[PDB]
């Protein structure tokens, strides 16, 4: 599968696993509420640190507003409705030098599988 | 004002600044999407690290589903519609021993002002 580099530093790299729907009406815009399912793991250890599929609750956030890590705002902005991808985030687009909480060390590369289910204004 | 200890360890202590609405229909239930405004600062320095009021975008999450730090799930579950509070979170209910990113050191106590605006199923 082709890998799309979403930044020029190779820090956000998306591989589409399931093509979403075409047409502009199926692409989200800044500010829209997007609804996604995701699973995140560390590249180094392969250990999953979080998943919306675990509780079976689609996760919602406002696109491009900094409610989530930078790599997500970049990756989800490139997706269309029903698209499923895997995206590889350098720490710069994740939790940086310090990491976050018990499961994410400083300087960790993150891999997420993200499905864009729907979005609205 | 009364300080309500929402856990027996004193780790989540909520002070109600503005009483919300009474009635069972005005208190959220587990799983409900809650819409809040919040301002979070470090207790030690009083430095604000994150605020939905900044972007003026009310923040939404699904209550009790582990989408947010534990202290928020506990605090918001105790609130009613239109309630505004200040809650003190020990690090156990925040970002723990490791902290998170640049702005939240390990072992930080957090203070959030949280307003419950509305909720729905």
């Amino acid at each position: 599968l082709e890998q799309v580099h979403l930044t020029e530093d190779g820090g956000v790299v998306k591989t589409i696993l399931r093509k979403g729907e075409g047409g502009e009406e199926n692409a989200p815009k800044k500010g829209n509420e997007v609804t996604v399912h995701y699973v995140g793991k560390l590249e180094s250890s392969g250990k999953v640190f979080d998943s919306s599929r675990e509780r079976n609750v689609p996760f919602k956030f406002h696109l491009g507003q900094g409610e989530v890590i930078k790599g997500w705002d970049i990756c989800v902005a490139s997706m269309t409705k029903n698209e499923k991808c895997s995206v590889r985030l350098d720490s710069k687009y994740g939790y940086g030098e310090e990491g976050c909480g018990e499961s994410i060390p400083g300087n960790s590369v993150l891999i997420f599988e993200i499905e864009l289910i729907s979005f609205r204004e | 004002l009364e300080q309500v200890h929402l856990t027996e360890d004193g780790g989540v202590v909520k002070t109600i600044l503005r009483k919300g609405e009474g009635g069972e229909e005005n208190a959220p239930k587990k799983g409900n999407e809650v819409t809040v405004h919040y301002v979070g600062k470090l207790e030690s320095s009083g430095k604000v690290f994150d605020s939905s009021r900044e972007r003026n975008v009310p923040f939404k999450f699904h209550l009790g589903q582990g989408e947010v730090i534990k202290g928020w799930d506990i605090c918001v579950a105790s609130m009613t519609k239109n309630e505004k509070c200040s809650v003190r979170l020990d690090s156990k209910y925040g970002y723990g021993e490791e902290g998170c990113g640049e702005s939240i050191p390990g072992n930080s106590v957090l203070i959030f002002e949280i307003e419950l605006i509305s909720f729905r199923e």
Binding site: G40, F49, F59, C100, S103 | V68, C100
Partner: peptide, 4 residues
């Protein structure tokens, strides 16, 4: 600072 989400998700983690």
């Amino acid at each position: 600072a989400l998700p983690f």
